[PDB]
Amino acid sequence: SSQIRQNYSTEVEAAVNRLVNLYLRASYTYLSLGFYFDRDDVALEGVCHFFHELAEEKREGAERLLKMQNQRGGRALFQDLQKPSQDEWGTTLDAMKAAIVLEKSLNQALLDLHALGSAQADPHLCDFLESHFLDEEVKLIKKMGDHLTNIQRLVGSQAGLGEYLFERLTLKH
Amino acid sequence: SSQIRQNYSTEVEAAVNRLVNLYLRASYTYLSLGFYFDRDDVALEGVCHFFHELAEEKREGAERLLKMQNQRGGRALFQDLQKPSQDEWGTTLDAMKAAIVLEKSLNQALLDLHALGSAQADPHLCDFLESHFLDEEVKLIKKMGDHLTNIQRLVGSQAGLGEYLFERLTLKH
Amino acid sequence: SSQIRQNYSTEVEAAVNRLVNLYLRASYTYLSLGFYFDRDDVALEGVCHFFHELAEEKREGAERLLKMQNQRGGRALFQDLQKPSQDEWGTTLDAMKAAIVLEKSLNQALLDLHALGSAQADPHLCDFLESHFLDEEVKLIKKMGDHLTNIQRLVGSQAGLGEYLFERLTLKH
Amino acid sequence: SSQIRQNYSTEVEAAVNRLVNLYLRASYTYLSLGFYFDRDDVALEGVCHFFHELAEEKREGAERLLKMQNQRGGRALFQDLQKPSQDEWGTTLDAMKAAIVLEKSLNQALLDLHALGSAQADPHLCDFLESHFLDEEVKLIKKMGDHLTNIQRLVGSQAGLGEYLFERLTLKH
Amino acid sequence: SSQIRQNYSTEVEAAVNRLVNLYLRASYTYLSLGFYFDRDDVALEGVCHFFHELAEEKREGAERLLKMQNQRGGRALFQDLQKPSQDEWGTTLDAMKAAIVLEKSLNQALLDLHALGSAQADPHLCDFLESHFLDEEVKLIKKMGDHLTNIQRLVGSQAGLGEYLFERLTLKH
Numbered sequence: 001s002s003q004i005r006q007n008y009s010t011e012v013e014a015a016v017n018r019l020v021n022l023y024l025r026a027s028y029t030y031l032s033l034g035f036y037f038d039r040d041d042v043a044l045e046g047v048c049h050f051f052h053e054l055a056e057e058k059r060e061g062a063e064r065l066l067k068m069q070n071q072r073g074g075r076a077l078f079q080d081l082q083k084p085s086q087d088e089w090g091t092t093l094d095a096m097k098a099a100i101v102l103e104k105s106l107n108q109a110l111l112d113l114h115a116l117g118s119a120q121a122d123p124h125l126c127d128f129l130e131s132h133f134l135d136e137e138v139k140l141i142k143k144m145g146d147h148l149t150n151i152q153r154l155v156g157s158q159a160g161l162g163e164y165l166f167e168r169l170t171l172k173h
Numbered sequence: 174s175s176q177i178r179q180n181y182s183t184e185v186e187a188a189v190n191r192l193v194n195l196y197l198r199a200s201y202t203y204l205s206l207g208f209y210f211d212r213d214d215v216a217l218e219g220v221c222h223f224f225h226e227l228a229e230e231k232r233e234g235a236e237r238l239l240k241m242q243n244q245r246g247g248r249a250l251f252q253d254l255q256k257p258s259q260d261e262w263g264t265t266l267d268a269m270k271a272a273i274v275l276e277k278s279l280n281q282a283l284l285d286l287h288a289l290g291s292a293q294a295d296p297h298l299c300d301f302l303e304s305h306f307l308d309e310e311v312k313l314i315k316k317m318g319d320h321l322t323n324i325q326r327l328v329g330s331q332a333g334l335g336e337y338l339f340e341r342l343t344l345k346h
Numbered sequence: 347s348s349q350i351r352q353n354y355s356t357e358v359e360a361a362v363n364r365l366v367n368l369y370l371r372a373s374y375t376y377l378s379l380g381f382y383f384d385r386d387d388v389a390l391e392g393v394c395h396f397f398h399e400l401a402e403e404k405r406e407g408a409e410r411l412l413k414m415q416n417q418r419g420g421r422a423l424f425q426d427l428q429k430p431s432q433d434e435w436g437t438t439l440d441a442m443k444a445a446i447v448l449e450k451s452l453n454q455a456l457l458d459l460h461a462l463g464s465a466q467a468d469p470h471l472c473d474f475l476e477s478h479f480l481d482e483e484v485k486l487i488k489k490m491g492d493h494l495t496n497i498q499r500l501v502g503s504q505a506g507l508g509e510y511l512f513e514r515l516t517l518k519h
Numbered sequence: 520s521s522q523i524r525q526n527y528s529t530e531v532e533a534a535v536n537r538l539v540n541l542y543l544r545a546s547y548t549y550l551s552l553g554f555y556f557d558r559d560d561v562a563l564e565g566v567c568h569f570f571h572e573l574a575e576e577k578r579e580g581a582e583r584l585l586k587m588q589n590q591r592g593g594r595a596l597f598q599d600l601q602k603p604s605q606d607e608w609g610t611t612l613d614a615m616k617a618a619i620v621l622e623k624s625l626n627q628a629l630l631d632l633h634a635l636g637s638a639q640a641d642p643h644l645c646d647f648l649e650s651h652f653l654d655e656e657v658k659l660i661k662k663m664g665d666h667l668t669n670i671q672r673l674v675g676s677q678a679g680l681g682e683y684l685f686e687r688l689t690l691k692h
Numbered sequence: 693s694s695q696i697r698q699n700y701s702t703e704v705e706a707a708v709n710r711l712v713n714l715y716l717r718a719s720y721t722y723l724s725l726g727f728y729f730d731r732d733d734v735a736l737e738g739v740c741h742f743f744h745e746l747a748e749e750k751r752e753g754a755e756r757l758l759k760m761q762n763q764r765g766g767r768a769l770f771q772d773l774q775k776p777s778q779d780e781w782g783t784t785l786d787a788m789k790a791a792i793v794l795e796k797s798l799n800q801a802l803l804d805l806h807a808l809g810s811a812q813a814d815p816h817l818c819d820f821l822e823s824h825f826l827d828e829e830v831k832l833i834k835k836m837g838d839h840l841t842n843i844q845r846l847v848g849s850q851a852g853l854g855e856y857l858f859e860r861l862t863l864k865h
């Protein structure tokens with residue numbers, strides 16, 4: 001409310017609600033990725049676990065944004081959550097490529113909101129993103145890039161072997 | 174690589190490689206300062222320890238920059254490391270004056286890189302420097318200034334006495 | 347200084363300063379090797395760790411030489427540190443071959459300094475090298491030779507598979 | 520005896536007996552130095568302790584030589600122990616200068632015996648000296664040189680002040 | 693001696709001395725196998741360890757036979773120990789095939805000595821072999837046969853890969 005709100009633009013408020021929607025959509029995408037790798041005809045437990053953990057992390061990011069919206073006196077507004085872009089996610093390589101495309105879209109949304117906060121002279125917003133989001137996203141994208149390189153090295157002429165070995169020896173089960 | 178790189182300018186990448194070189198050069202200067210105060214004809218153990226700890230801290234700073242270069246998808250490029258500016262470092266006062274000149278050159282390089290990141294709208298870079306470098310450097314320069322004042326108070330007409338007492342009663346052995 | 351110096355030739359003093367430069371150059375080479383294997387497009391953590399540990403070990407060797415220089419009353423003299431011979435290090439096999447070439451150059455420098463100490467009738471120098479350097483170097487070169495053989499066995503017709511498996515099952519992560 | 524003796528020259532045997540005499544004489548000199556600094560008109564406890572510890576260390580060195588003489592099948596032969604060179608030892612500076620002259624005479628005797636062992640192709644003798652004596656002597660002479668430099672820095676125009684402060688703040692009480 | 697000897701034939705006594713020689717020869721063969729797999733150009737630590745443990749076990753078997761020879765009042769007689777049949781042992785498969793040939797020769801010698809004890813009505817001898825040797829040998833030969841099958845499965849078209857993986861994932865390091 002207006003009782004606490006100070007230096008918190010309507011533009012930032014609306015962009016925070018849109019970023020909550022993006023993070024919840026990303027969480028839903030990772031929920032779908034994780035259950036796909038739990039199928040009996042896919043059966044890669046370390047890949048399931050990897051994506052299920054990211055579903056939780058993206059939900060938590062949305063909840064931290066909503067907490068901050070209320071700390072600044074803005075009002076949460078929820079929109080429909082679109083379903084994920086695919087029903088089946090292919091190989092671990094296909095899934096990791098889709099994940100890094102998703103993360104770079106979140107990172108660009110964070111950078112766009114930081115730029116809006118900078119333009120609005122909203123240093124609390126800018127610090128909030130720097131402290132809780134920007135480095136978490138750079139670290140995650142580096143880890144996904146590391147995983148992509150290792151998955152790609154393992155395809156060789158024996159793709160099933162490579163997919164098994166990556167799941168067994170890199171990912172957590 | 175281009176697989177992870179996002180919002181990371183070639184200007185920042187090059188300036189990070191130059192700052193790694195500056196931090197490694199500073200580490201090498203402090204290595205030389207510390208071994209000079211271990212000479213049998215100098216023999217000030219607390220001064221040796223002070224500079225040897227700074228050699229480690231500046232190496233660690235370079236390694237954190239290199240880690241960040243790879244997290245952003247830039248490429249580390251190493252150059253020759255120039256030898257320190259002196260082979261013998263004079264009195265503890267001379268050495269502490271040389272140290273604060275070195276630290277203010279590092280601090281200005283940090284501030285210049287922060288300004289470049291600001292101009293490039295690179296908030297991850299700016300936060301990285303604010304979080305791991307800028308306050309560490311202000312604290313160190315304050316401590317060196319405190320030490321300079323105490324060393325200067327102790328010169329009096331008995332410079333050897335004063336140098337001994339500072340090493341014994343302020344510095345760590 | 348001349349206050350403590352005894353049986354410590356100017357030839358040995360100068361050769362110890364050159365060996366410090368060689369060890370620091372080797373440390374710098376291993377720093378570069380380790381950050382190359384941390385690139386997102388290389389991404390071999392066990393290889394990164396292997397080389398980063400050697401960077402530390404070679405720095406420590408240089409510092410033990412400098413300590414000994416001062417214990418004998420010689421004077422440390424630092425020179426420029428040349429950059430490593432490559433900016434990119436190829437495969438783990440290429441990197442391990444470069445590492446064993448580097449180590450055999452250090453070992454020959456140790457053996458040359460031992461021979462000079464022998465010729466100068468400097469038994470403290472000879473014992474110092476025997477006690478802290480010669481067996482450490484033989485052990486390291488044996489381990490690198492063991493690793494080269496295992497890497498070479500794994501190339502087969504599936505080089506990426508082999509590189510992954512060596513990193514996962516031999517090297518430490 | 521001839522029952523165990525092997526590769527142990529009569530020259531080395533005699534030189535070991537002479538070195539025992541030198542170490543016992545050095546022990547006796549340090550006994551005198553320590554009791555002089557315990558006089559009520561001298562009264563420098565940290566200096567007393569420093570020299571009394573060296574009296575013990577030099578006795579222990581003689582006893583290790585005698586143990587080795589019997590392990591090699593040589594025969595200990597004792598000679599008269601000459602009294603120390605002074606009855607009163609002056610200032611801490613005078614005493615530390617006398618101590619480093621004494622230690623460099625012991626070190627030259629060690630180096631001479633090592634050279635004789637080398638010439639006699641007696642590697643057990645050479646290793647024994649390298650392992651238990653040569654580095655102990657280099658470390659001690661470095662510490663004495665460090666102390667001389669600090670004592671000299673403290674003389675200034677207030678020699679009594681400096682002598683008190685060195686004893687209080689460097690030496691152990 | 694005749695003071696304790698009872699029901700212990702000269703035939704059994706001589707055959708026990710021959711079996712000691714066979715076990716010591718087997719120990720020597722396993723010593724050679726283990727050091728071959730420690731070569732830098734072979735470098736299979738789990739294979740080294742496997743054979744070095746068998747060298748110890750075969751020595752211990754010989755020592756238990758010698759203990760029993762003296763408990764029965766026979767007299768140990770030692771013969772020359774022939775060197776192993778090869779200086780280089782080929783692949784892990786070649787080495788494991790040589791090991792099972794060696795073990796089946798030991799097992800046949802045990803069975804022959806049991807038959808002699810049976811014929812001599814020497815139940816202490818027969819029980820001694822049943823209790824300490826016959827099942828140990830059946831268990832070892834089963835384990836070697838298990839290993840041969842797994843090594844053979846791994847040759848495929850990538851023999852170096854298979855040899856590495858067997859050493860890493862079956863044998864102990």
Ligand SMILES: [Cl-]
Pocket residue numbers: 080
């Ligand atoms: Cl709606």
Ligand SMILES: [Cl-]
Pocket residue numbers: 253429
């Ligand atoms: Cl260059």
Ligand SMILES: [Cl-]
Pocket residue numbers: 256426
């Ligand atoms: Cl220069």
Ligand SMILES: [Cl-]
Pocket residue numbers: 599
């Ligand atoms: Cl007499």
Ligand SMILES: [Cl-]
Pocket residue numbers: 772
């Ligand atoms: Cl014979």
Ligand SMILES: [Ir+4]
Pocket residue numbers: 034038045048049052
């Ligand atoms: Ir799951």
Ligand SMILES: [Ir+4]
Pocket residue numbers: 034035038048049052
């Ligand atoms: Ir799951």
Ligand SMILES: [Ir+4]
Pocket residue numbers: 034048049052
């Ligand atoms: Ir799950």
Ligand SMILES: [Ir+4]
Pocket residue numbers: 118126127296
């Ligand atoms: Ir900002």
Ligand SMILES: [Ir+4]
Pocket residue numbers: 169519
């Ligand atoms: Ir693991």
Ligand SMILES: [Ir+4]
Pocket residue numbers: 049172
């Ligand atoms: Ir987990």
Ligand SMILES: [Ir+4]
Pocket residue numbers: 173
């Ligand atoms: Ir597991």
Ligand SMILES: [Ir+4]
Pocket residue numbers: 207211218221222225
């Ligand atoms: Ir030091």
Ligand SMILES: [Ir+4]
Pocket residue numbers: 207208211221222225
């Ligand atoms: Ir130091």
Ligand SMILES: [Ir+4]
Pocket residue numbers: 207221222225
């Ligand atoms: Ir140090």
Ligand SMILES: [Ir+4]
Pocket residue numbers: 291299300
């Ligand atoms: Ir900023």
